[PDB]
């Protein structure tokens, strides 16, 4: 029953996704605002803890007790100089315990402090609850997936935030080894086959090279951005959006806080309906001194301001490709992971890049991750019996 289910957790830097592997498919679990991703947010406030869409939806409210980016932190010593650099951009206190970093906050007006691990476990036990009101009933057994680049330390603060989450880890598996499941690249024969997986979050941008030599994965490079994500491309909008109210209306709206995130949430929006129209409009009522911004824009536009972006994604491809020491045409398949590869632009950069070539694209790109780590949660319950 239980004891013979296996579930499959993306523990993603903004967002998580769970899935299963029943009757020979596999189900990304919905959580209970219909969402197949889930805000990898944990907030604190005068009665309550919230984790998710709730707590992504009062971040502007609550800024000081709304954390994410705990993946930035995990398995890392306070002394680190990503954590360093990291701690001058978030909104809630992060505190040194003996050099590991813990986040402060306040709880039900109480100061509380927690390790990175203990926020992720937050995360990891809403996604174990949406699975288990998904299949009415406990599951415990899981794969967790971590970046290809995670070391020991953070492997094992990951595998820590699963027990704490009261999960059994069956296997800390990589992200882009996931996602080559998810396609069925390791179950093609004999030969080593080389994979390119572009994976391009909300956050983070992550170019894996792996070779699949009869069913053994071997990773051979890894390159990216670990400051590049859909959120810049918000906030390209957002500035176009600000320099046009200034141009109708002659007033700066930049300072006005409540403007500025009614316009990036709108923009967000915005920019996902760009992916598969050629426009998109924006309605918000009373953006700043009661006037109302009702505007469109086109892709082409958006296009424009992210060009340089866009353009940058491919340096860490080919950085791979030489860290790899392969060419582009001894490349087998090339696999998209991360919502923002939905972008048109970016596909078409893509492959234009790999001259011409088909890009597997077919799964949901913020749930392959997750489809691949519940095929393998699967194969692992399986023969454990
Ligand atoms: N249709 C889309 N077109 C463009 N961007 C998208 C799309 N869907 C998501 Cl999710 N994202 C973005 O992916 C990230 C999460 O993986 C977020 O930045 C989200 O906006």
Redesign the pocket.
């Known amino acids: 029953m239980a004891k013979a289910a296996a579930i499959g957790i993306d523990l993603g830097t ?2 998580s996704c769970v899935g299963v592997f029943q009757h020979g498919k596999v189900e990304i679990i919905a959580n209970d605002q219909g969402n197949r ?1 889930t805000p990898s947010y944990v907030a604190f406030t005068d009665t309550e803890r919230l984790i998710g869409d709730a707590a992504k939806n009062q971040v502007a409210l609550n800024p000081q007790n709304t954390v994410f980016d705990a993946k930035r932190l995990i398995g890392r010593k306070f002394g680190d100089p990503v954590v360093q650099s990291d701690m001058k951009h978030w909104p809630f206190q992060v505190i040194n315990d003996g050099d590991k970093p813990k986040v402060q906050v306040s709880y039900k007006g109480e100061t509380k402090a927690f390790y990175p691990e203990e926020i992720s476990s937050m995360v990891l036990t809403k996604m174990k609850e949406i699975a288990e009101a998904y299949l009415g009933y406990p599951v415990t057994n899981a794969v967790i997936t971590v970046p290809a680049y995670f070391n020991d330390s953070q492997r094992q603060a990951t595998k820590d935030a699963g027990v704490i989450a009261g999960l059994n880890v069956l296997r800390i598996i990589n992200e882009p080894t996931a996602a080559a499941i998810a396609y069925g690249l390791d179950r093609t024969g004999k030969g080593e086959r080389n994979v390119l997986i572009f994976d391009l ?2 956050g983070t941008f992550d170019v894996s090279i792996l070779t699949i030599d009869d069913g053994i994965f071997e990773v051979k490079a890894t390159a990216g951005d670990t400051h590049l ?3 810049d491309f ?1 906030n390209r909008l957002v500035n176009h959006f600000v320099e046009e109210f200034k141009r109708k209306h002659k007033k700066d709206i930049s300072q006005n806080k409540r403007a500025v995130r009614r316009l990036r949430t709108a923009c ?1 929006r915005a ?2 309906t ?3 129209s050629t426009q998109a409009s924006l309605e918000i009522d009373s953006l700043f001194e009661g006037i109302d911004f009702y505007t469109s824009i086109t892709r082409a536009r958006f296009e424009e301001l992210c060009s340089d972006l866009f353009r940058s994604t491919l340096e860490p491809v080919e950085k791979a490709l030489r860290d790899a020491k392969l060419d582009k045409a001894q490349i087998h398949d090339l696999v998209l992971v ?3 590869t ?2 048109p632009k970016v596909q078409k950069l893509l492959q234009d890049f790999f001259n011409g070539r088909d890009l597997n694209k077919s799964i949901n790109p ?1 749930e392959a991750v997750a489809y691949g780590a519940a095929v393998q949660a699967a194969i692992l319950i399986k023969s454990t019996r």
């Open positions: 903004t967002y991703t979050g909300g994500g859909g959120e918000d967000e920019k996902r760009l992916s598969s991360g919502g923002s939905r972008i913020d």
